[PDB]
Write a protein that binds this ligand. Sequence first.
Ligand SMILES: Nc1ncnc2c1ncn2[C@@H]1O[C@H](COP(=O)(O)OP(=O)(O)O)[C@@H](O)[C@H]1O
Ligand SMILES: Nc1ncnc2c1ncn2[C@@H]1O[C@H](COP(=O)(O)OP(=O)(O)O)[C@@H](O)[C@H]1O
Ligand SMILES: Nc1ncnc2c1ncn2[C@@H]1O[C@H](COP(=O)(O)OP(=O)(O)O)[C@@H](O)[C@H]1O
Ligand SMILES: Nc1ncnc2c1ncn2[C@@H]1O[C@H](COP(=O)(O)OP(=O)(O)O)[C@@H](O)[C@H]1O
Ligand SMILES: Nc1ncnc2c1ncn2[C@@H]1O[C@H](COP(=O)(O)OP(=O)(O)O)[C@@H](O)[C@H]1O
Ligand SMILES: Nc1ncnc2c1ncn2[C@@H]1O[C@H](COP(=O)(O)OP(=O)(O)O)[C@@H](O)[C@H]1O
Ligand SMILES: Nc1ncnc2c1ncn2[C@@H]1O[C@H](COP(=O)(O)OP(=O)(O)O)[C@@H](O)[C@H]1O
Ligand SMILES: Nc1ncnc2c1ncn2[C@@H]1O[C@H](COP(=O)(O)OP(=O)(O)O)[C@@H](O)[C@H]1O
Ligand SMILES: Nc1ncnc2c1ncn2[C@@H]1O[C@H](COP(=O)(O)OP(=O)(O)O)[C@@H](O)[C@H]1O
Ligand SMILES: Nc1ncnc2c1ncn2[C@@H]1O[C@H](COP(=O)(O)OP(=O)(O)O)[C@@H](O)[C@H]1O
Ligand SMILES: Nc1ncnc2c1ncn2[C@@H]1O[C@H](COP(=O)(O)OP(=O)(O)O)[C@@H](O)[C@H]1O
Ligand SMILES: Nc1ncnc2c1ncn2[C@@H]1O[C@H](COP(=O)(O)OP(=O)(O)O)[C@@H](O)[C@H]1O
Lengths: 73, 73, 73, 73, 73, 73, 73, 173, 173, 173, 173, 173, 173, 173
Amino acid sequence: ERKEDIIPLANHFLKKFSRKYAKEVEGFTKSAQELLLSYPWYGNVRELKNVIERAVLFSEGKFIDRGELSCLV
Amino acid sequence: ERKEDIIPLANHFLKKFSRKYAKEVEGFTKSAQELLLSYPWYGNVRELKNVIERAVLFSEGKFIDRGELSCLV
Amino acid sequence: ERKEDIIPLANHFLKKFSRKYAKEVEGFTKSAQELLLSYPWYGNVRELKNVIERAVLFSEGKFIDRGELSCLV
Amino acid sequence: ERKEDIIPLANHFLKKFSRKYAKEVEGFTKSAQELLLSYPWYGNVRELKNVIERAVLFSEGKFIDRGELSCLV
Amino acid sequence: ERKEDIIPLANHFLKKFSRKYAKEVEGFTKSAQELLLSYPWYGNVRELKNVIERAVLFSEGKFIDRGELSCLV
Amino acid sequence: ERKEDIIPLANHFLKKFSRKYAKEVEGFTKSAQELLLSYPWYGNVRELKNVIERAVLFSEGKFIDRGELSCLV
Amino acid sequence: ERKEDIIPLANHFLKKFSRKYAKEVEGFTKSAQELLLSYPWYGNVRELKNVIERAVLFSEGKFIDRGELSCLV
Amino acid sequence: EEYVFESPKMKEILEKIKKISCAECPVLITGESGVGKEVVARLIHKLSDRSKEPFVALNVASIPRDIFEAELFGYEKGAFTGAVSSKEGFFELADGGTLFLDEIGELSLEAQAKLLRVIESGKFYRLGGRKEIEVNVRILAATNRNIKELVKEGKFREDLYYRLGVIEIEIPP
Amino acid sequence: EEYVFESPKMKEILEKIKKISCAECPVLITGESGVGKEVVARLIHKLSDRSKEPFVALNVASIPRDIFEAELFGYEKGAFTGAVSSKEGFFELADGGTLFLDEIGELSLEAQAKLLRVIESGKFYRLGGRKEIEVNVRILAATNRNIKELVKEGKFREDLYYRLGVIEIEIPP
Amino acid sequence: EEYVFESPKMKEILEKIKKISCAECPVLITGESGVGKEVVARLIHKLSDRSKEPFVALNVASIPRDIFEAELFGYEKGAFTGAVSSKEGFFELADGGTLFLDEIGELSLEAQAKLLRVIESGKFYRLGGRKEIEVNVRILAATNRNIKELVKEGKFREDLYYRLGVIEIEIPP
Amino acid sequence: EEYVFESPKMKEILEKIKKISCAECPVLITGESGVGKEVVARLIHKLSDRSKEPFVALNVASIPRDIFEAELFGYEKGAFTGAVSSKEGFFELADGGTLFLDEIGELSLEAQAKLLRVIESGKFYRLGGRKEIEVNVRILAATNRNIKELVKEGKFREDLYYRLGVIEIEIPP
Amino acid sequence: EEYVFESPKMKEILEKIKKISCAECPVLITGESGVGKEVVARLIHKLSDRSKEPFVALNVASIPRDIFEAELFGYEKGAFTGAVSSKEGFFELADGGTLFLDEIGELSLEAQAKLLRVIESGKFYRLGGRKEIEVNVRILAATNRNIKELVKEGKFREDLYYRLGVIEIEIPP
Amino acid sequence: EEYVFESPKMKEILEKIKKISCAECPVLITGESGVGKEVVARLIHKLSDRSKEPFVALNVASIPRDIFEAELFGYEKGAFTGAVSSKEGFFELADGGTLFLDEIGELSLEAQAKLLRVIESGKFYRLGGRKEIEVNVRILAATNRNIKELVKEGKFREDLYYRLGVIEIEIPP
Amino acid sequence: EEYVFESPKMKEILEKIKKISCAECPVLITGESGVGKEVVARLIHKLSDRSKEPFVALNVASIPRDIFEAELFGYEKGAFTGAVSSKEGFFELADGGTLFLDEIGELSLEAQAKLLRVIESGKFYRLGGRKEIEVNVRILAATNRNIKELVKEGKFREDLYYRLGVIEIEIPP
Ligand SMILES: Nc1ncnc2c1ncn2[C@@H]1O[C@H](COP(=O)(O)OP(=O)(O)O)[C@@H](O)[C@H]1O
Ligand SMILES: Nc1ncnc2c1ncn2[C@@H]1O[C@H](COP(=O)(O)OP(=O)(O)O)[C@@H](O)[C@H]1O
Ligand SMILES: Nc1ncnc2c1ncn2[C@@H]1O[C@H](COP(=O)(O)OP(=O)(O)O)[C@@H](O)[C@H]1O
Ligand SMILES: Nc1ncnc2c1ncn2[C@@H]1O[C@H](COP(=O)(O)OP(=O)(O)O)[C@@H](O)[C@H]1O
Ligand SMILES: Nc1ncnc2c1ncn2[C@@H]1O[C@H](COP(=O)(O)OP(=O)(O)O)[C@@H](O)[C@H]1O
Ligand SMILES: Nc1ncnc2c1ncn2[C@@H]1O[C@H](COP(=O)(O)OP(=O)(O)O)[C@@H](O)[C@H]1O
Ligand SMILES: Nc1ncnc2c1ncn2[C@@H]1O[C@H](COP(=O)(O)OP(=O)(O)O)[C@@H](O)[C@H]1O
Ligand SMILES: Nc1ncnc2c1ncn2[C@@H]1O[C@H](COP(=O)(O)OP(=O)(O)O)[C@@H](O)[C@H]1O
Ligand SMILES: Nc1ncnc2c1ncn2[C@@H]1O[C@H](COP(=O)(O)OP(=O)(O)O)[C@@H](O)[C@H]1O
Ligand SMILES: Nc1ncnc2c1ncn2[C@@H]1O[C@H](COP(=O)(O)OP(=O)(O)O)[C@@H](O)[C@H]1O
Ligand SMILES: Nc1ncnc2c1ncn2[C@@H]1O[C@H](COP(=O)(O)OP(=O)(O)O)[C@@H](O)[C@H]1O
Ligand SMILES: Nc1ncnc2c1ncn2[C@@H]1O[C@H](COP(=O)(O)OP(=O)(O)O)[C@@H](O)[C@H]1O
């Protein structure tokens, strides 16, 4: 109920971890950003924190889209 | 074989219950007292105990006569 | 003996189920409403409850008339 | 097979109990002594022990004869 | 009513079993194929399944004709 | 199958026990020695050990013959 | 699926043990080497390790052939 | 709408129920099959002080005579091969509320007694041993047979009769 | 290839089945022996939402009337001499799926009741005691006798009729 | 008012009771069912020195023959699957008072013995092991069968007979 | 010496037996009484791969129709008054070997079915419940009646016919 | 007065007892029920050197086969749910005296062995672990069955036979 | 030679493992018995930065639920009758390395919590008192049950789920 | 005199024993009951280098499956209500000598594993914690069941098989 938070938060996280695991990950793609906004996030902020540490590690290029995310969300 | 007991006992009981169920029942009428003395009381003291708890509850006014009793005895 | 109940009740039911099975059924037609009022309803309220869950499912359009009902009533 | 024992034993017992239950019982009468000697005493010494504790208690006066004994033997 | 099935099916079966019982049986002869098509097959697919397991076992050479079949069909 | 053992062994035993229970038993008589040799000794050495401790105790004089032995063997 | 391993491995083992139990065992005979290669070795390397410690101990001369092996393989 | 009572004798019996309201003495209901006995129990209880409290109705015929004295009351562990826990009771489930025993005549002499003991003392024990539970349950017996008769047949304890015979209602066919 | 439906009344009945698809209310099927009842149940279930779920069909005649109330539901340990474990149930095996009771009329009054209780509450207990299991089973009764009749004979509980009589299909010989 | 004794043979038996007063030797009561046996026990005890002391009456028939030797005496823990505590005893509950065993003939040979041992020694142990409890209970056996007979049938220990046969009262029908 | 086969039709039937050797599909033998049916079963099995394995021949007539469905298969405890142990089975005794059911026509519809289920699945359950045993038994039915006929009489399940009718041998009088 | 022995074979057996006096080897007594076995044990012990020492007679039938190997010997703590103290033993209670095991045939194979070990070594351990106690008990077995037979039935250890079969007395009916 | 991974979904899962390499967040592995869970943990750790560091795998089922909260963590002296020294811990033994808790669902609510506290704080105390030890252990939970479900059953703490649910791998049968 | 071996296959097996002399690898003996397995173990050990060393034979059936993993190995204090001292072990008692586990198939999966670990490492710990004892015991397993089979039944660990299957002797009935 704060879809206006998912994309900013997520982006926070993607930054934390991208720096924590030294990964050249800059950010999410549109296709991905959508998904993140549609997911119900039962865990809420917590679950997104995990979903993205996980997506940062699984990340291969500079961005994240339906690819790594769908694996979870 | 103690008809001299029925009316006193009965009267005991009518008191117990009249007080137990908060009923404005003072006592038996002549017509009633007769019946009680004629009944054979197979159950004896026990049966009279019941017959009257029952008559105290069934009681409507201040007294008990052929009315409620006949229902049983 | 409450024909003034059949049409209101029925209408209750038709609503319950129309919503329970996601059926675009709005209500009964005159022709149908008549029948419902003439049926003896031995089962009474119960039988009407069934007769209509059944009629809601069997329903094809937006309304119910002699058609589906006669199948039963 | 020791009728020479019945009367002495018995007399032992009558003493034990007469003292055990504080009964003014001194001993058996002839009439009684006979009986005791005729009884077959299947239980033997045991049965006589009982028969007399029992006779000591049942005793009313100072002696025991056909009276209390016959009750048993 | 699927005579276009008998010969293909049969051929399926003859393969199953020829392999199941290690029999050098390759297939049916014309003469045989005819029969199979004329039989009424009350049991239908089932009966043909049996008729041929049976014919595969009874088989002596590389083929099956009026010979083994007539035994049944 | 060592009848050449029965009489020596036996004699061993008869010595052990004769000394164990302080019995003036010197040895077996011919008549006895025979028996010991004929017995099948299912228990073998063991059974003879027992048979003789037993015979040493049962012994009355200085020797053992058919007497005590037959009791067993 | 490494029959190219059985004979070398085996030979490893036969050396280990021949030295471990001080046995003058030099190696396997052709006849034996064959068997070792045909056995399925479900246990694989492990089973061969055992099969040969066992064959080294059972060994009588300087070599091992169908003899000791068949006992197992 | 409502329920149905309009004949004199029943116009009556309803009231008798109403009066009995403020009571707890057991009640003995008797009428042919179908007459409305179990309908009266239910009404007596809807009217008693404990209406909101549970109603534990149990057909005494709906249980093999050898397991009634195991389910009515309860059961103390390991006394009968296989016991997952000392068994609770309909008496215990009916604690604080009504316990409508239907078809009373079908009570074994053993339980007829065991009930009596609980109608007077109100305490009971599951099998051999002693009482360790407190139950406050109003007894409501209903039977279609004639109790009295059964008493001369010895199939029905008399003292248990008079005990349940405190209040007695008879439904006419 | 396919199955067989082509006569009007059946061209129909198939559809009725199709519509009923999205439902779970019990269904009462009736037709002479051989008419295809048990073939319709099976089809109803192939079409219901729970097609992939199990189909627990059990002939109510294929079990002695005294052991049906022991196998349909289940059994609580030591209540009948010899119990290797509290007995599971066709109801429990049919949990999540369909339970096609064939030849309903052959249900004992005791189970006719016991079923009703599970058609409404959906909870059941194995013998004396209480419910401790959760079963979601769609009832599918089929009988070749005329239910209604049986109701005036008292051999068949009426309320259990209307309960299964939610959806009723009649196969013409 | 009072109780009832007026026939000669009973005018008697009452006294026999009165005399026996100051005693504690067991007593064997015998008469047909209903004759008043259990009424005499109760009276014997109302008259014994220990009237104010408890009266532990237990029907030997009111308990499965396999659990009598578990409830009369008591039970030492873990000897039979499931034991919440070493089981007390009616003997222990009757300690200091009377223990009226009704229907004696119905005693298992095993307990008939086990009782004897406690009638003489007065000490008992719950199951295997040894006595660790002190009980002072006056035995009062009553049976409606003919003891002697049972002795030739081997169903009743003789020595246990004579032991309870100290004082013997016979109630005439 | 040897056995006896020399007429053409039998000179034949022997071979048919020999070929069938390497098989396990059930076999249906039919001929008038005495023709040698049960002699062929026995020979078929002496020749099958499982000759050394047991031969469980059982006359379906040598057992009251109500106890066949109790001895062929087996029996789950306490389902019929008195059960010393869940009953084993001729199917279980014949596990791994042949099961020669003589006089098939004499199979109750109930078992005719129950057999079919075991000819296809190979699994069976003793009474109500589920299969918990693994049996590998080759069916060998022999009957002197004409099966087909019985099928139009409804006394013999057709699908069970074709199932046993895999291999069919007919002994001429 | 005295006891009773006057028939030749018993006029005898008494003496055999007298001779055996100065011994301790186990003794095996055998005769039909009632013949006087347990009367001889008792006499053997009244005559042995340890007459003044205890007599621990225990009926091997008077204890469930699963608790004999718990009471004869003893029990090491926490090995069976619930242990108030490692359990002593009749062997330990009989230490220094006689241990008359009545009805030997009724010994479990497990104890038959466990006894043997204590008849030879004289040392025993309560359950798993090792011996830590010293017992000097003279074994006196009496049984009414024929031992030898039981040996071919495998119900009775042979070596345990010969071990108790040191001295063997047979009481004629 | 090597190990075995070749199917797509696993060709995958291996990589997921490889990527996770440079991490330490707990990992939740789930698949039916035998699927290779514990084989993946082991591989994850062979690949993590701490491969050379210890691998403390402990089956949560291989220890009575009442002693897990005594061995996982550790134990502060004299808190449970008998303590030779405050007990170390698998957590402490796994310090610096991996701690593969197998079959997580089998964690008591008490430890499920106690773990959570150590997954976040990383500090723990042996029993009552406070943390005085420093442990750096990477959690690796593997279970064959469905976690989520257990969460609606209340048997599994949710917050502990998401905490271990950082990285989640699911092995397909 | 001597012992008994004269048939070829045994004339053999004796030698196999003799050769195995200078070894310590476990040995797996298998033959029907009575064939002489435990007689061979004993002989193997009389012949091994450690003949003078102890022989700790223990029937794996002669101990309740729940206490084997408490007596084979040993026990760490206070881990099971009541512990007089951390329990020693048959492994520890067999240290330096042979440990003949009879009837291996009867090993719990938990111990089957726990043994394996000690057959390879030779170190063991009593309950939860770590190994602190040094045992040098030669394993000698004998079973009358067919191991291999049990492996497909999952009742017997395979790797534990091959480990004991170093030397394998099979005694023919
Ligand atoms: N004499 C009496 N006076 C007053 N109430 C009595 C009298 N006798 C009995 N009752 C009452 O009647 C009931 C009958 O009691 P009870 O003494 O047990 O009878 P019984 O003679 O059968 O032992 C009792 O609950 C008591 O309250
Ligand atoms: N007056 C009503 N208005 C709406 N629905 C009703 C009414 N009466 C009954 N129903 C419905 O019909 C069914 C009949 O219910 P119920 O009250 O149990 O009948 P009965 O009178 O036999 O007790 C119920 O499931 C309920 O949902
Ligand atoms: N000879 C006797 N003289 C006195 N009293 C005896 C005599 N014999 C037995 N009694 C008494 O009789 C009872 C019988 O005792 P007991 O010696 O046990 O008999 P039994 O011969 O059956 O062993 C004992 O309690 C004892 O007090
Ligand atoms: N169309 C088919 N093609 C190949 N084999 C078939 C075909 N139909 C049936 N069979 C075989 O024939 C047997 C008949 O099977 P089944 O489907 O059960 O018949 P039914 O129509 O009576 O249900 C099966 O065991 C199967 O292997
Ligand atoms: N050859 C022998 N010479 C003297 N005494 C023997 C001899 N053999 C056995 N015994 C005695 O017989 C008993 C049988 O002993 P044992 O050696 O155990 O027999 P087994 O052959 O069954 O092992 C022993 O107690 C021993 O004292
Ligand atoms: N007085 C009544 N008014 C309305 N319904 C009644 C009345 N009496 C009985 N019934 C109905 O008749 C049925 C029979 O009820 P019940 O009283 O339980 O039988 P029984 O008297 O044998 O126990 C009930 O389902 C109830 O709805
Ligand atoms: N409409 C149908 N189309 C094809 N086959 C049918 C049809 N109806 C019945 N059958 C067949 O007839 C047989 C009788 O089936 P069934 O419905 O189970 O009998 P009943 O109606 O008495 O329960 C089945 O084996 C089935 O294959
Ligand atoms: N002599 C008596 N005087 C008064 N009442 C008696 C008398 N004898 C028996 N009773 C009554 O008869 C009933 C039967 O009693 P009871 O003695 O217990 O039977 P039993 O003799 O079979 O044990 C009792 O309830 C009691 O009130
Ligand atoms: N072909 C045969 N050769 C030799 N003996 C035979 C032959 N056929 C039958 N028999 C004998 O005839 C008897 C009848 O056998 P059987 O086959 O069991 O009868 P049925 O065919 O009715 O089952 C048998 O005892 C058997 O020895
Ligand atoms: N020889 C005897 N002389 C005197 N009494 C005996 C004699 N033999 C047995 N008895 C008696 O017979 C009873 C049976 O005794 P017991 O020997 O214990 O039986 P069993 O031989 O079956 O063990 C005893 O109570 C005892 O007093
Ligand atoms: N992908 C795999 N490649 C090779 N071996 C495997 C693989 N997966 C499992 N195994 C083997 O299967 C066995 C089962 O292992 P494990 O993963 O521990 O079971 P679980 O998944 O239930 O914890 C192991 O001994 C291992 O050698
Ligand atoms: N080859 C043999 N020579 C002499 N005695 C043997 C031989 N084999 C077995 N025995 C005897 O048979 C008995 C059975 O022994 P055992 O080997 O322990 O049984 P199992 O093989 O089942 O473990 C032993 O007491 C032993 O004396």
